[PDB]
């Protein structure tokens, strides 16, 4: 095999991890509180050793687009109905699973949120919101969520995007694609490495997607490269919807157009069943979500998600209130 690295917890490992998260949910008032934010990486050292070994070695592999952990138990009855909105989605039934995601994430890096996304929460919610079916945000449904680097507009975007599937009864697939190196000619590749492209911020950073900097990003975007790093294993920064060539740059336009078609043709599906966790490498792969028909009956697809950077100090310029919410 697969383009991702997969780990399946044994029942005993899964019980121990869940018990750990339960303990944290008893001792800490909230997942995004400063106390648990600082303690979670240390508490994570108590997770099962086989899981910690996987996370430590897999993060260092050069190939995988995602780290996938399967087999966390989720009791639908204890979980309760899927919320109608992210504002009210911190339900007691989902609380321990949110702490669990935080613990797993603490093995990979430093977690943060965005002041302009779900009220600057660190653990956020992905669920279908009635009326937002044909939008370009993660609460869409009937409209396929086009592939994208998470927060491509920003130089402080996550290195990893964590997704915990609380329920996915219809098996809706997350979509993934890597750099199509096997099909890019060297000239096209060279152009993609140059600062000849524009990236606007996606709609989830707009004021209409929050309760009661981003402006200058979609209005006066600075030219940026789509590919960086090693020619033979580039890092990727693109958004299928919000990317564009520099004004009048027909050679960059042709390179982006080619890249769109190659990623479209190489997109593959990863189904996160209930309890599955995925950490998507936001530098090697773009990700999206297949279109699906929302239910609105209380059992809709529901994910918790979290942004992870290897170095919070790389984003010092963007620290808003504290270091864990970027502006
Ligand atoms: N090309 C795009 N649709 N980009 C935006 C992706 C959705 C974004 N990850 C969100 O949480 O809403
Ligand atoms: O809907 C999914 O499975 C992924 C959503 C997504 O792209 C995100 O919020 O990072
Ligand atoms: Fe995304």
Numbering used by the authors: 21 to 232, 242 to 356
Which text from the study accompanies this structure?
The utility of the method is highlighted by studies with three X-ray-radiation-sensitive Fe(II)-containing model enzymes: the 2-oxoglutarate-dependent l-arginine hy­droxy­lase VioC and the DNA repair enzyme AlkB, as well as the oxidase isopenicillin N synthase (IPNS), which is involved in the biosynthesis of all penicillin and cephalosporin antibiotics. However, maintaining an anaerobic environment for di­oxy­gen-dependent enzymes has not been explored for serial room-temperature data collection at synchrotron light sources. This work describes a methodology that employs an adaptation of the ‘sheet-on-sheet’ sample mount, which is suitable for the low-dose room-temperature data collection of anaerobic samples at synchrotron light sources. As demonstrated by the lack of turnover observed with two 2OG oxygenases and IPNS, our method slows di­oxy­gen penetration to a level that enables data collection within a reasonable timeframe.
(1) VioC (Streptomyces vinaceus) is a 2OG-dependent l-arginine hy­droxy­lase that catalyses the production of (3S)-hy­droxy­arginine from l-arginine and which is involved in the biosynthesis of tuberactin antibiotics (e.g. viomycin) which have been used to treat Mycobacterium tuberculosis infections. Importantly, clear differences in the active sites of the two structures were observed, with apparently complete conversion of 2OG to succinate and carbon dioxide (not observed), and of arginine to (3S)-hydroxy­arginine in the air-exposed structure. The non-metal-ion ligating co-substrate/co-product carboxyl­ate is positioned to interact with the guanidinium group of Arg330 via a salt bridge. Binding of both the arginine substrate and the 3-hy­droxy­arginine product in VioC is characterized by interactions with Asp270 (with the substrate/product guanidino group), Ser224 and Ser156 (with the substrate/product carboxyl­ate group), and via a hydrogen bond between Glu170 (part of the 2-His-1-carboxyl­ate triad) and the α-amino group of the substrate/product. Structures of VioC in complex with arginine solved under cryo-conditions have revealed a second conformation of the substrate, which we did not observe in our structure, probably due to its lower resolution.
